[PDB]
Amino acid sequence: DVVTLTRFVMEEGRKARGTGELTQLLNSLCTAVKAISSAVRKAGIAHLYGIAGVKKLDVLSNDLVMNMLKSSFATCVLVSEEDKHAIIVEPEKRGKYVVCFDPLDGSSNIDCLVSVGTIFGIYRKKSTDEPSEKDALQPGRNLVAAGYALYGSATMLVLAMDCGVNCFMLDPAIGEFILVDKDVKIKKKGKIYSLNEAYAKDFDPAVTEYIQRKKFPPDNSAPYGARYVGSMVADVHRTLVYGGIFLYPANKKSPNGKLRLLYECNPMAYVMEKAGGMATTGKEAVLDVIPTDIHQRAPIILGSPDDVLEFLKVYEKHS
Amino acid sequence: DVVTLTRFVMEEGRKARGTGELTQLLNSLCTAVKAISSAVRKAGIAHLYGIAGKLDVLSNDLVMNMLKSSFATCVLVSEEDKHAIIVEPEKRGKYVVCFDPLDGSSNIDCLVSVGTIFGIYRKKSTDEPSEKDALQPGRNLVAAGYALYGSATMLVLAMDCGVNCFMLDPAIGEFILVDKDVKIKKKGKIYSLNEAYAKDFDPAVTEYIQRKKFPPDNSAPYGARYVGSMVADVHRTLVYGGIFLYPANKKSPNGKLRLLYECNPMAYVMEKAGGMATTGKEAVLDVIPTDIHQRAPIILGSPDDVLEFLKVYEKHS
Amino acid sequence: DVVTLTRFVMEEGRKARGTGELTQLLNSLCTAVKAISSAVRKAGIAHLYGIAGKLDVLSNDLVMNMLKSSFATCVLVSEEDKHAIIVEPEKRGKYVVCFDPLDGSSNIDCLVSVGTIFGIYRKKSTDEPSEKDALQPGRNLVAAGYALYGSATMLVLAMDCGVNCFMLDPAIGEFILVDKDVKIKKKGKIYSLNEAYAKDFDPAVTEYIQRKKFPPDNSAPYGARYVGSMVADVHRTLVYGGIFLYPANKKSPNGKLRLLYECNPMAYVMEKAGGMATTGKEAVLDVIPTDIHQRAPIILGSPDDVLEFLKVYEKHS
Amino acid sequence: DVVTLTRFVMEEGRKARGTGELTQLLNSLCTAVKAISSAVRKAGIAHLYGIAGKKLDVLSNDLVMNMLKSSFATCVLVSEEDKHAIIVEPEKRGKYVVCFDPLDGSSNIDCLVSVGTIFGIYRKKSTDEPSEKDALQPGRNLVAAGYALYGSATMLVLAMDCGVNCFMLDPAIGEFILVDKDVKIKKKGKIYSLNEAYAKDFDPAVTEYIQRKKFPPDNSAPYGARYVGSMVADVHRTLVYGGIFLYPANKKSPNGKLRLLYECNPMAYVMEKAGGMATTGKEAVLDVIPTDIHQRAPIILGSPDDVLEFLKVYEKHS
Ligand SMILES: Nc1ncnc2c1ncn2[C@@H]1O[C@H](COP(=O)(O)O)[C@@H](O)[C@H]1O
Ligand SMILES: Nc1ncnc2c1ncn2[C@@H]1O[C@H](COP(=O)(O)O)[C@@H](O)[C@H]1O
Numbered sequence A: 001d002v003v004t005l006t007r008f009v010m011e012e013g014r015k016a017r018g019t020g021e022l023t024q025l026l027n028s029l030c031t032a033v034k035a036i037s038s039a040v041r042k043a044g045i046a047h048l049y050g051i052a053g054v055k056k057l058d059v060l061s062n063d064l065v066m067n068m069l070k071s072s073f074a075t076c077v078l079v080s081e082e083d084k085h086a087i088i089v090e091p092e093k094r095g096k097y098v099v100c101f102d103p104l105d106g107s108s109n110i111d112c113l114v115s116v117g118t119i120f121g122i123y124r125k126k127s128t129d130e131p132s133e134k135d136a137l138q139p140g141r142n143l144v145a146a147g148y149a150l151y152g153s154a155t156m157l158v159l160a161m162d163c164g165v166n167c168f169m170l171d172p173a174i175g176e177f178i179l180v181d182k183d184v185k186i187k188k189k190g191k192i193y194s195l196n197e198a199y200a201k202d203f204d205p206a207v208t209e210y211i212q213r214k215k216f217p218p219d220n221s222a223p224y225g226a227r228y229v230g231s232m233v234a235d236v237h238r239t240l241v242y243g244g245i246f247l248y249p250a251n252k253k254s255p256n257g258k259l260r261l262l263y264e265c266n267p268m269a270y271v272m273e274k275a276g277g278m279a280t281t282g283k284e285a286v287l288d289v290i291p292t293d294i295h296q297r298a299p300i301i302l303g304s305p306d307d308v309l310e311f312l313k314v315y316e317k318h319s
Numbered sequence B, C: 001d002v003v004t005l006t007r008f009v010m011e012e013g014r015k016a017r018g019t020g021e022l023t024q025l026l027n028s029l030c031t032a033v034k035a036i037s038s039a040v041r042k043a044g045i046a047h048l049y050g051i052a053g054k055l056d057v058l059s060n061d062l063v064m065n066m067l068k069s070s071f072a073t074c075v076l077v078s079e080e081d082k083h084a085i086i087v088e089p090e091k092r093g094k095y096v097v098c099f100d101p102l103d104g105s106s107n108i109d110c111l112v113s114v115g116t117i118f119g120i121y122r123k124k125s126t127d128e129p130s131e132k133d134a135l136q137p138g139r140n141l142v143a144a145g146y147a148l149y150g151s152a153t154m155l156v157l158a159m160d161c162g163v164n165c166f167m168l169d170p171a172i173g174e175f176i177l178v179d180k181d182v183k184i185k186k187k188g189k190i191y192s193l194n195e196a197y198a199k200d201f202d203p204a205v206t207e208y209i210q211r212k213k214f215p216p217d218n219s220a221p222y223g224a225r226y227v228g229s230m231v232a233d234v235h236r237t238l239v240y241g242g243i244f245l246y247p248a249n250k251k252s253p254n255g256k257l258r259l260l261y262e263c264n265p266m267a268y269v270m271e272k273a274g275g276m277a278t279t280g281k282e283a284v285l286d287v288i289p290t291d292i293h294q295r296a297p298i299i300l301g302s303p304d305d306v307l308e309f310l311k312v313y314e315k316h317s
Numbered sequence D: 001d002v003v004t005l006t007r008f009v010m011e012e013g014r015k016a017r018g019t020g021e022l023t024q025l026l027n028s029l030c031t032a033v034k035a036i037s038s039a040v041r042k043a044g045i046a047h048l049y050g051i052a053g054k055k056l057d058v059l060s061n062d063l064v065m066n067m068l069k070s071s072f073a074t075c076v077l078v079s080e081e082d083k084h085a086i087i088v089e090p091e092k093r094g095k096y097v098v099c100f101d102p103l104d105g106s107s108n109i110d111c112l113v114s115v116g117t118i119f120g121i122y123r124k125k126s127t128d129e130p131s132e133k134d135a136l137q138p139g140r141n142l143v144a145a146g147y148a149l150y151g152s153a154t155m156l157v158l159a160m161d162c163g164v165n166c167f168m169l170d171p172a173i174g175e176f177i178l179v180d181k182d183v184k185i186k187k188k189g190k191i192y193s194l195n196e197a198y199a200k201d202f203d204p205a206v207t208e209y210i211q212r213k214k215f216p217p218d219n220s221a222p223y224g225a226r227y228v229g230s231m232v233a234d235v236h237r238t239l240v241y242g243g244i245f246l247y248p249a250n251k252k253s254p255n256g257k258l259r260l261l262y263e264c265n266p267m268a269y270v271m272e273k274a275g276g277m278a279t280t281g282k283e284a285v286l287d288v289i290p291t292d293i294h295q296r297a298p299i300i301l302g303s304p305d306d307v308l309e310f311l312k313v314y315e316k317h318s
């Protein structure tokens, strides 16, 4: 039976015997995402070039996501990549959830018409205290739901919650997300590696060794294929679907990595873990780092379990 | 004030005093690219998943049928077809179109950028059409371009006057001209190639890549980016500048990419944008084919980046 | 704040402390309707005219399938099917839905507005589901409404709390709420019926019409509009006020529009919008169905206009 | 096997050996009609309703106007929406005068019924500096005319000297597909269309005619009646399914209410080219010499035999 994202989430809420606050939050985020998809695809640019005689996309996506999340009456703290401070929703529109999100990841690459996406992660406010940004600083392990939408050749939403990962595809002709892959699990070992090899001179010796093992295999197996789109969502998605490892490791220029923790690392780490994968900083699992700044960055090496173990072994070999 | 692809192509056709045949051909190609864009975006998959109770094949069919219908073609060479398709006599015209309907079709599962590459040579031969009519060097190209289905659908069309990028507005289904007489940056900052095959790279491309991560003059290293979809990687080179290399690595030491419908369109585009495209040994538009599916090595990009590659190449010959 | 048909129905759902059966049924209906809208706007037909080489059945199938799949229906009565469909025991829920999948389908050739009409009852008996659960008088409706595919697509949804109108934004696949707690004008200035039947009208309606063209006093005449598809005509009546009439006539002694999925849904919308709907002899919402495809007379619209019809009607009984 | 509007129009420009200017005008108009259909269908209303935190017929006029000036094919543009004729800037002038109603019946849009765009195109017949007088040509001199109906699907009906051709917009690729070729009207239909409020003000010929239509003298079946109140929807149903449309003169002007240059003449032209008729009661609509760009005219149009039947009872009350 076809199932849409909306009929799936609603039914899952019924099983969960929830009041419907998270379901609203999610039905809101699903509209924000169709609107961002529509804009990314440039529906309307004829008007910008004077067919009849606008905001930069990342400003617009931040506004659509934030406006729909406030109007859901399910949020109290929202953290966005675009905003230096956590937004505390006005009491009238308050609910119990905290939402960390990256509205248009890889937006830099839009001029080059590169895949771009939206990352989000949902924490329940654990405090009984008046909402402050101290409610967003929860470890990834405490996530209720997390996921991403990827605006590629087609638009796909991947939604991860305690039951697992489910992929959903947008049909633009009717504005519905159809369930196309349920209970997605990742390849145990894959054949591809992703990292920006441009930083070769600033790489950590353990990273340096791991790539070489993939280029010139000791046991003279097939060399691993290289791929690096440079937009996190395109890269974790291909890693989920096909398997392999994605690395955005700590390199000398940026000792804590470059990728932000709450809205890029923890959502992706949670997807990867619920699909049978792993995500590690090198030292710990990404989902266990306890955040001290809502915009804190983390190293991330994530992907197919065997491949992350192999990296972790060359890593442990340099302690 | 607005120009659409249709008004541009019709107007250029007028300036050139053409019979209207190449104009009818480019229009058919435009409709095909929109129909492929809608199908790449999965418009209608709810009907597959049973709401009311192949894509690369579809793309090939859409292009084939539209081109035949244009009454502008005599020989059609496709990536999906082992032999050149010769048009029925009634539907014949003077042009030869070589096209890869959906480059990177593998990647559609990972929803990675996909594209339609195409080249148009005029049939100069007096004879009845045959596969040999597709064996003309890229230097004999009348027009070429691609359509990328990346985060938005953009068509890049290059003809004698220069390159022009067009943005598809899906709402009204119209390609609006967004960039005229495009010229690529002289030097770029990104190098693109699959470093997995490092084990099989001839010493010159190995030395080239090293000079990009550890620069002799102490500049900053180039960034690395590799979609693994030629159209995607060449459009980022066209727009952001840089160099793209699918060299002959020992595993497939003739290159991978095909000359008639992959390398020569992107090469023609690069030359009309002020760029360069080489096999290392010679310029890609000049290598005369022996086989419609002949592979070639190709290195293309900003003039000073491709010039830099040629210098380490010649320092190994 | 924007409110969409999805966010609005959820909230009504939580206020009503429902189990979510009806919310799932209304979510299902929403999807079906955006799918029928696309099919009506002829999306994809290029494919049929060979770009690469009956609308009501597809509409019946989209509403039928989305409804069995909601797990909330147990008896479905469509205009298309001669018998009430009984849902399969695994897929049963408590609601009984009567619907006309693409009302006005006969005029789609002439590109006339078309729409979908639905009513939702709640099964009353504990017996095995049968055609008899569908036979409840209109007064017992939990919700009812229609979707008009006109110059834009609109869904009007009446529930006990009131009538609300939603507009489809086709760029994002969302029904945005544009009018909330609609109420109809008390007296209108448009009368709507097929005056071609004049030879067969009973004297009450023949007097009533003459009374609108030649006012017995000296009011301006009422203007006349008859699009010819109930959804288009009753939607104009709701928005602009007036009266719509499709009475019995000798050839249709019992009327022509069907009680269960045409008259009762519109009567419920009229009545919750502060309007009236009558057969002439009794309110449409109070007649008891004996058969599912039963015909009935209906005059509906602004309260003052319908009352003035009822006075000339009773003057001839 | 498709032929699109772009291909049909281009192939036809080539056969007629034109310079290509009429082809640029007609191409420009096709885009403007697709831009309007998107707007009519409410694509984007979420932004107006604040998803991120009449104007429709003024926008329609802006889309048609700016697309035709840029075609470089026009020199005088007469719009319903504008009091005076627009003269094109000397550097963008071509040889065509276009008369158009950019969104016909945009009163019915609240109620969401069918609205449409109507146009007729003329060639400038004199050497003089362009003026409103260039637009003052009887419809007999039209080069091409048509309309676009934004009904349940969007359709463009184009009528040129060779015939009337109906094209359907596939919105999923924005392409007008030729769905029917060289269209001909039925000789006689079974629908009559007019607003019967005016019964009080109807002159005796149309009162007699409509009466013969509901109480048919020869005891045949009576005609059905339909009236949408948007001329595009009403004339289109008349083309497609046959019958008669009337919007006659009465005390609300002895001259009718619809307009000659951009409502009457385009539909009168399409009607004749589909094998139908269009009269003012006295002269064929395509022959009345206009003297003002917003001049009104009575119009009865439709199947040949039906218009001929009205002319018989019209002539009876003179
Ligand atoms: N739609 C949903 N799908 C998954 N679980 C949900 C759903 N809605 C609510 N639940 C769960 O029930 C708890 C309370 O939900 P709620 O009452 O809606 O705020 C949440 O923390 C969720 O984990
Ligand atoms: N639309 C076009 N834009 C660019 N040049 C064209 C155009 N159409 C034709 N010409 C030129 O004229 C030659 C013959 O065109 P034709 O006779 O129309 O098929 C072409 O091969 C082009 O070099």
Ligand SMILES: Nc1ncnc2c1ncn2[C@@H]1O[C@H](COP(=O)(O)O)[C@@H](O)[C@H]1O
Pocket: C009, C010, C012, C013, C014, C016, C017, C018, C019, C020, C021, C022, C023, C122, C142, C159
């Ligand atoms: N979404 C809703 N809109 C308004 N009424 C509702 C809704 N959901 C539940 N109801 C009311 O509560 C009753 C039980 O609904 P339910 O248990 O979900 O099937 C229905 O018959 C309605 O009268």
Ligand SMILES: Nc1ncnc2c1ncn2[C@@H]1O[C@H](COP(=O)(O)O)[C@@H](O)[C@H]1O
Pocket: D009, D010, D012, D013, D014, D016, D017, D018, D019, D020, D021, D022, D023, D026, D123, D143, D160
């Ligand atoms: N696309 C076409 N369809 C049919 N007739 C055309 C078309 N293009 C040109 N014509 C005819 O040729 C004449 C001269 O063409 P032009 O020089 O472009 O204005 C026009 O006034 C028309 O009568």
